[PDB]
């Protein structure tokens, strides 16, 4: 699982000695997060499960 954007924090002060850590800027181009599960070794484990089911 990955999140490919490169964020950039920026702390905002909302009171006396307590801050709110915002997100100031995204460096680069914005790209959707995702996760990769190898289709071979996932279909094989689904086969195992369906056999035991």
């Amino acid at each position, epitope marked *: 699982c990955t999140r490919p954007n490169n964020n950039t*924090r*920026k*702390s905002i002060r909302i009171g006396p000695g307590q*801050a709110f*850590y*915002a997100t*100031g800027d995204i*460096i680069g181009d914005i790209r959707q997060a995702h996760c990769n599960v190898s289709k071979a070794t996932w279909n094989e484990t689904l086969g195992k499960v369906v056999k035991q089911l």
Partner: antibody
Amino acid sequence: QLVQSGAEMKTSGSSVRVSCKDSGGFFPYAGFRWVRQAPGQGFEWMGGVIPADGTKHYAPKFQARMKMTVVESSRTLYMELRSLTSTDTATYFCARLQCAGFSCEMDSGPFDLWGQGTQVTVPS
Amino acid sequence: DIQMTQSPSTVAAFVGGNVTLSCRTSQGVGNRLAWYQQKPGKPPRLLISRASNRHGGVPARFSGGGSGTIFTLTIKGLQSDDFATFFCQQYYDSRETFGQGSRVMMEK
């Protein structure tokens, strides 16, 4: 303002500890940088420490030589450079990332507040 | 990494004169580029952010331009307090690196 230790002189092999105390807070709000300037030629990134999350980020060159610490009680950054050399003579600055009002950068901005400098000379 | 080559190094100038620097990066930094100014002893003084946006306390005579890879800095009407060493900094990638300085002299 950030104020540093006085200019020092060390021997080839000894370890030098610079310091950087920031009078005015800004400790849990901004991210500080360690930058050294060789005599009369540009700058050279050397480290960076966000004291809010306590994340240090050493340059690849000075990755094994130095180590930087934070002391929240006295509000001071330390940069201890262990294996000195004749080529580590430089003016050492501690900076602070840009703060636009009350929202301070923590990760990447231009350095807007600098320290006075600590001229460390190591001849050999 | 990212390398900054400052084109005109140690360019002479006279008071009330034009002077144009140049900072050319190795790889594009968008507009994330700052311009510093250091007088021989003091620590640097940040002049410009975002390669065009001046700061509080910088005269209007300073001007940052360009974008992408080639950036400039133009001081239109010089004064006797502007002769220093100007550094350009990218803050795009993880570790911001500076140029090597480009002095401005006073020989008339």
